[PDB]
Design a protein around this nucleic acid. Structure first.
Ligand SMILES: [Mg+2]
Ligand SMILES: [Mg+2]
Ligand SMILES: [Mg+2]
Ligand SMILES: [Mg+2]
Ligand SMILES: [Mg+2]
Ligand SMILES: [Mg+2]
Ligand SMILES: [Mg+2]
Ligand SMILES: [Mg+2]
Ligand SMILES: [Mg+2]
Ligand SMILES: [Mg+2]
Ligand SMILES: [Mg+2]
Ligand SMILES: [Mg+2]
Ligand SMILES: [Mg+2]
Ligand SMILES: [Mg+2]
Ligand SMILES: [Mg+2]
Ligand SMILES: [Mg+2]
Ligand SMILES: [Mg+2]
Ligand SMILES: [Mg+2]
Ligand SMILES: [Mg+2]
Ligand SMILES: [Mg+2]
Ligand SMILES: [Mg+2]
Ligand SMILES: [Mg+2]
Ligand SMILES: [Mg+2]
Ligand SMILES: [Mg+2]
Ligand SMILES: [Mg+2]
Ligand SMILES: [Mg+2]
Ligand SMILES: [Mg+2]
Ligand SMILES: [Mg+2]
Ligand SMILES: [Mg+2]
Ligand SMILES: [Mg+2]
Ligand SMILES: [Mg+2]
Ligand SMILES: [Mg+2]
Ligand SMILES: [Mg+2]
Ligand SMILES: [Mg+2]
Ligand SMILES: [Mg+2]
Ligand SMILES: [Mg+2]
Ligand SMILES: [Mg+2]
Ligand SMILES: [Mg+2]
Ligand SMILES: [Mg+2]
Ligand SMILES: [Mg+2]
Ligand SMILES: [Mg+2]
Lengths: 77, 149
RNA sequence: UAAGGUGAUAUGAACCGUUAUAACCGGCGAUUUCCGAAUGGGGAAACCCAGUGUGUUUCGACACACUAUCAUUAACUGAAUCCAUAGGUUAAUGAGGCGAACCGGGGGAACUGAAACAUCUAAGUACCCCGAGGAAAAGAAAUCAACCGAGAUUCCCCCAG
RNA sequence: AGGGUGACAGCCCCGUACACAAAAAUGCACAUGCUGUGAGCUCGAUGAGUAGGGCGGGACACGUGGUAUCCUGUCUGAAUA
RNA sequence: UUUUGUAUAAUGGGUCAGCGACUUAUAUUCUGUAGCAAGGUUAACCGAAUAGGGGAGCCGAAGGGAAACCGAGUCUUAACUGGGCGUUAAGUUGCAGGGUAUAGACCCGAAACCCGGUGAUCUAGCCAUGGGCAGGUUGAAGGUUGGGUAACACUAACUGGAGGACCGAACCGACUAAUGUUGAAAAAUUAGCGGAUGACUUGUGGCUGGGGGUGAAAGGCCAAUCAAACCGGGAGAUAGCU
RNA sequence: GUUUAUUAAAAACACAGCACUGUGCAAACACGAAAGUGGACGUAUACGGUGUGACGCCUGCCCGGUGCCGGAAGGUUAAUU
RNA sequence: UGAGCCUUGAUGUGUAGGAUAGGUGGGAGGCUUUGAAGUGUGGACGCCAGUCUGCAUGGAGCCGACCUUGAAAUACCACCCUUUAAUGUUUGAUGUUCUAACGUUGACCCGUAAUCCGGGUUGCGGACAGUGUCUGGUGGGUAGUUUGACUGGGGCGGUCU
RNA sequence: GCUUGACUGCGAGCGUGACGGCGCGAGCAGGUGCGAAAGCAGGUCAUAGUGAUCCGGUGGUUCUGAAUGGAAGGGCCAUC
């Protein structure tokens, strides 16, 4: 599913509004990308489906700290 | 992204320095190779430990280089046995162990290696310059007056 | 507890019992076919077909037990690839499905009303889905107030159509 | 109270008020015991891709309106008593 | 009943019996009636439970002004001879009732819109696997021979057995006519008619699902239902109409 | 040959043939929020779409409009800043 | 190939003049042997007067109160304003090249006696492509709807204050 | 010829309209013009020459100003 393993960003629903304010149901999808992340703690590439923000979160927290939060959430990576 | 370097990098820096790198370069290249590691509030002391475990164990030695090289002006009067003939010039030679065991009398540590003798072997009964290898850069001083014997 | 009893249509038959194992009532127990989450594999539900391990046999064949999946943990093992890791086998623990309403969450109509209609309305209603519990959610101020002070959340009546 | 009994029963019957009762199992309360969880003091510490912002949406009675406040899909991004 | 007007040949009713339509809740106003009265009354809740307590509140006793503000006056205007609204009138809470409002709102009744399901045992198309086509005809290519060219070209005979080929049964279909039209039958029967080795037909099973399918295309067919199926739900949709 | 099962079998549909156009393969295109699947275990003598509709003689003038293709100095022009 | 900017090297012709006076202070001479001053001349700038610069050999000298002059010497120091050359350097466009993201419905290896999947090795592309958010355009492909009344029936026409 | 009464605030009372509204209006206050003065003048001989509300805009006005001082916005007056 279109969910980020770091953040848990999933598609959220909303409305498209026109100039006449005609509302129509629509989805907001995250900016999900599969990216291989270097885990130097383990000498291994780990592949995560992640949002661009989760990519920012990994840079900040470090993939080592992040993955410890994932295996503390199930979330087999 | 601010990161430090574990090696020299072409158009960036040298052997450890905080510089600002695009996230993709650091993330997709610099960190997967061993060319860098970010500042994470730890590597400003942890890989900055090769510059702080360094200084935690390099700091106090900068002073030893002096006290290991100061008390050699105390005597300035040493004379060592060796053969010596006419004209004031010598018969034999002067190695380094000649002066290494000579001034063990003077107490504080002295060696044959951490003394250095010139390429000439002091074949004179006359002042010919010598120095001590106390510190590698700072030169310490040697002059012995070989006993004209 | 008892002189009456063997459920009903429902009579009859053959019997039990009457001073305490008749029946009846209650508690703990026992048995509890097959299907069905159905779980050994399959399948047109109540059927078909096994495997392993024991113990039995007159050597024709019998009886019982275990054998799903997933998750977790563990042990053993184990690639490409030296390490390792994936992967494999087993054990143990737990889950699975059903169920009225209430609850929380994820999605989300239109008729209709506007005396047409699109904003708006209907309505976060109906409906679908996930999950839980005896209730759930919420909850101990980064709240209100107005220079006086109140002192978490929830529900009721007012404030007020 | 009621329900029955050959028509309408306080006294025919079953019952009702009232009084009593459990081998066995069990509930909710109490007391008490084994096992595990930690108070009390003292000094420290005070939740960052977060708050906030831009874009698009939603929620707040409040339809973006002069619109605070909450949530966030996207891009960003502090101070830290 | 509906109408200007109905014996009307305008509507409805075969008959009887039974059922079948102005309700309920909350707000609001007017009337009546009762209580108290410049005061009336409590709500939730407490409970000494239809008591009593609870006066938080609501209405009323003052209005004018957009408002600050003023106040039996106020606003207006620089100010009124003035003018507008007001002062000179008891209300309030119950009970009953008449209206209004929100709710299905007097009852019955649409076509339809939307949500979620059920359906390809009919039919349409496709997929796989099996089957069926009596009998009779025509006689393509090719082949062979004779004939003919320097050799190819070539022409009778035999052979051969092609074809969305011919006639015609089973089988598949349905052009005409009659019958029947509360039928034997919610599409048939009778006589004739078309195809009948193919783009054929048929059995078994399978796939496609509703704004979707499938369609040699008729808006045809998708279980006697199709310009959006069926069932259930929204739902007592709405109905200025009958 | 096909068709309005149940009032229309036809001049309608289809048809071989013709042309135009798209498509270089992870093809276009289509079903699918997606994965994927068909196309096709095919590869431009192929595939999809459109129109015409055996065969024969042929298919004339018009690119102003609308689309399609291409071109690009200038003008107009969104988010953003 | 566009621009800011630590910081320095160039930019300062009312004219008096020895001839190219932003300015206050710090001060009386700064540089010249990690080379003075004299020559050719480098590509700059210029009021047509020379300012400063690259280099050759060079080897003991150009530079004030100078008298004048509203101003006293680029003699040194120093913050600083008109001007204008460069790069460590910030982000802009284009072009080329790369690889490490990303892709691969290429080959090969293992998982695995598996045309899925994953991992691995390799090649090919490669910051493209592709996807998210935002945005302009297109958009009966699909949806929701509108498309008036009077009227000697309706429609056409005419009319609507 | 002179001028700005095509004035500002009000308005007894009438008229005409279902209403919204439209119209006529002496006289009062203030200020003006014409005229020696009486007086006339609140547009044009009259009756057509127009468009509700909403949403906004502009100017004025310290009416209001969500702790408070301001401001925003709102109100009120004039006009689009
Ligand atoms: Mg079984
Ligand atoms: Mg099974
Ligand atoms: Mg609607
Ligand atoms: Mg309507
Ligand atoms: Mg709406
Ligand atoms: Mg926002
Ligand atoms: Mg009539
Ligand atoms: Mg009539
Ligand atoms: Mg009559
Ligand atoms: Mg009659
Ligand atoms: Mg009639
Ligand atoms: Mg009649
Ligand atoms: Mg009748
Ligand atoms: Mg639906
Ligand atoms: Mg549905
Ligand atoms: Mg058929
Ligand atoms: Mg035939
Ligand atoms: Mg025939
Ligand atoms: Mg048959
Ligand atoms: Mg027959
Ligand atoms: Mg027939
Ligand atoms: Mg035939
Ligand atoms: Mg038609
Ligand atoms: Mg049918
Ligand atoms: Mg339902
Ligand atoms: Mg109805
Ligand atoms: Mg409804
Ligand atoms: Mg035919
Ligand atoms: Mg027909
Ligand atoms: Mg017919
Ligand atoms: Mg045609
Ligand atoms: Mg034709
Ligand atoms: Mg173009
Ligand atoms: Mg349409
Ligand atoms: Mg509608
Ligand atoms: Mg009409
Ligand atoms: Mg006057
Ligand atoms: Mg006139
Ligand atoms: Mg204002
Ligand atoms: Mg405030
Ligand atoms: Mg304030």
């Amino acid at each position: 599913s279109r969910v980020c393993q770091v953040t848990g960003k999933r598609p959220v629903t909303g409305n498209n509004r026109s100039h006449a304010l005609n509302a129509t149901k629509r989805r907001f999808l995250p900016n999900l990308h599969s990216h291989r992340f270097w885990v130097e703690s383990e000498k291994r590439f780990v592949t995560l489906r992640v949002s661009a923000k989760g990519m920012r979160v990994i840079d900040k927290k470090g993939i080592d700290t992040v993955l410890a939060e994932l295996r503390a959430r199930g979330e087999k990576y | 992204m601010q990161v430090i370097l574990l090696d020299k990098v072409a158009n960036l820096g040298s052997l450890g320095d905080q510089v600002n790198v695009k996230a993709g370069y650091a993330r997709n290249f610099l960190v997967p190779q061993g060319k860098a590691v970010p500042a994470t509030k730890k590597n400003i002391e942890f890989f900055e430990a090769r510059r702080a475990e360094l200084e935690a164990k390099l700091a106090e030695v900068l002073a030893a280089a002096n006290a290991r090289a100061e008390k050699i002006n105390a005597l300035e009067t040493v004379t060592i046995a060796s053969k010596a003939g006419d004209e004031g010039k010598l018969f034999g030679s002067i190695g380094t162990r000649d002066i290494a065991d000579a001034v063990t009398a003077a107490g504080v540590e002295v060696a044959k290696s951490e003394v250095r003798l010139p390429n000439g072997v002091l074949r004179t009964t006359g002042e010919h310059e010598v120095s001590f290898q106390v510190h590698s850069e700072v030169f310490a001083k040697v002059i012995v007056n070989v006993v004209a014997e």
